[PDB]
Subunit: 341 residues, 2 copies
Amino acid sequence: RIISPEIMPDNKVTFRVYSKDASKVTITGEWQTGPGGVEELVKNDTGMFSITVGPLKPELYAYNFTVDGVKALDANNVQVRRDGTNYQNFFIIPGPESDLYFHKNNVPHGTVTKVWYKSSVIGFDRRMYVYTPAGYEGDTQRYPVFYLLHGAGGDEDAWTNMGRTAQIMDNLIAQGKAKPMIVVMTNGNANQAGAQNEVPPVPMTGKFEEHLVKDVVPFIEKNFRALTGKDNRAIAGLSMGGGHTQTITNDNPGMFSYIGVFSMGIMEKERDAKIEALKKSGYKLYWIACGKDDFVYQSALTLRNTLDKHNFKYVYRESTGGHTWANWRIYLSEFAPMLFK
Amino acid sequence: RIISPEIMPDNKVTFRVYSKDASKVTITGEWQTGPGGVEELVKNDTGMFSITVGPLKPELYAYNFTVDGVKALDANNVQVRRDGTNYQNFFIIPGPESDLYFHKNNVPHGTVTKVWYKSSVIGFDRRMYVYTPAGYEGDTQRYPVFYLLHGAGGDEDAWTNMGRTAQIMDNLIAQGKAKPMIVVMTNGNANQAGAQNEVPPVPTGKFEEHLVKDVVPFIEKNFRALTGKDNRAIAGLSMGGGHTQTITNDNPGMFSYIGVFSMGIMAGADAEKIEKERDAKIEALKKSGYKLYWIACGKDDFVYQSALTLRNTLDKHNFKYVYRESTGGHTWANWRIYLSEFAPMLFK
Ligand SMILES: O[C@@H]1[C@@H](O)[C@H](O[C@@H]2CO[C@@H](O)[C@H](O)[C@H]2O)OC[C@H]1O
Ligand SMILES: O[C@@H]1[C@@H](O)[C@H](O)OC[C@H]1O
């Protein structure tokens, strides 16, 4: 039996790959410096390649191997994630910064529902994922709703798979840090019916955004025990989805009171008029989060300046790092506790 | 820029792996006969390894590569399944025998819900998957319920992932071949809270007792379920076919449609006393008003003789069943076939 990864008491991590045939086995992982920082495993006489890295800071880290030039996952690690077409293994180093990302056996767990709905706007049925809080079943309580949008290359599975949304929400809700809430994760690619690993291509500017308001929101409010109205609605998205969030809220002032723009910036006289209408809409939070090293940083500054021009109040969270799921998990973790308060 | 697998118009399939630095790439796949059936890809002078196999009969086939002694999936194939800890790619050769396994864009799709429930019997909360038929949302109709159980090594994700349950049910229901129904896929491992790829380990007869005392009431409370035996079906494969027998034998009159896939006689205590209890349970079930007892098994399965022993014992009791013998053995290919044939029989 081969243990890989093996997390040590000092948060070093050992990885192992067996092969007497292979010449070179490397590992690519999210703790590394960059492409030049790929690391080579050391082969012993027995055929075992191994490497120990770290100590690593608490976080979720994805990785894979490369065996004589071919990508290979870690067959001894059952934890596998998917980012579009890119599959990688992962592990989580325990500690304060990663604690919300674990699936804990002593925490009540919310349901994840993969549900299809008709779309009058797009013209074919589409799939979304809906998280409901623990204890939703068997009760009559109604809950506010948070619409959570992915970026380019993603799909309705991404926020749970890459973003650990079910764990983050289970843990925040159980800890009393976020209110119980329904989280709705749409597929933001209007040409798709659902995630490409399960749903084939179907045999469009503005259509996703229009469909969220005209098709998704009514379906959620009809088919789930949802509170209604702007103070019970939140919306956030990353990158492309942060653009969707702006378009949706700019075009529908007074529909969402909690608005989050993750790793995205600006995308006219119409623009200024829509800011003025949104400014007067009674919103409660406009939260902009971006990493200092993200290529979109300057565009996010332009967004902030454009809001400043209108004396439009927002909160800005600048973080370390760049355009990564590590940052998007952090942003979700910080934004969800702000909602519906 | 690399297509792999490339399914050709004649149902041959080409696989490709690129690396100038690799020495040997082989492929392991379900069209092969045994471990000595692994096949070597041929390397061209530009670093592309390739092989063309087939023609293959219509079916879903899983596969992976081995690169210089290390398992590797096909990075150009987004279709990946999981059997416990074993991940493999797959593809589906179109044709009559595989058509139900495709996700079709012109077919209404049922919801798959991953829901947690308290278990008084097991003592901690557990996860199951529930399929509801297309159009469940937004309507008031109630639906009969089919409990579908996996075997050893599986979990509540297996029947949808390995078994293509959502596609089979969507397609059968849309074609009018099976009635709209709720399909409940439990985790049959009483020591687990949920599937090992998502849920960590937790700090007998318990599964079977919990299905009746915890799962069924939760489904009937929280889903729009018709109830009573004529609205209730249960089937399972291997270990889950054993669970199916134990549950139905211990609760005669609770299920009208019973499916035993790739499983035979249950082990028991003296040999005679076991047979007396077994006889009594057969007789009570015989008189229970059930509608269908369906036994399906591959002729090459190790369990074949035990399933024959079961059939012979039922014959001795004049207990009416239907037997479906198939080609092949103890495989998800057969379990998909069995689901595809059993679901159209239910609730009619
Ligand atoms: O899930 C997607 C991420 O994978 C994507 O990340 C970008 C991918 O291309 C690289 O060149 C960029 O550096 C990297 O940020 O971001 C969008 C998200 O939807
Ligand atoms: O891998 C198979 C498993 O999925 C099933 O549960 O029992 C038989 C095994 O061969």
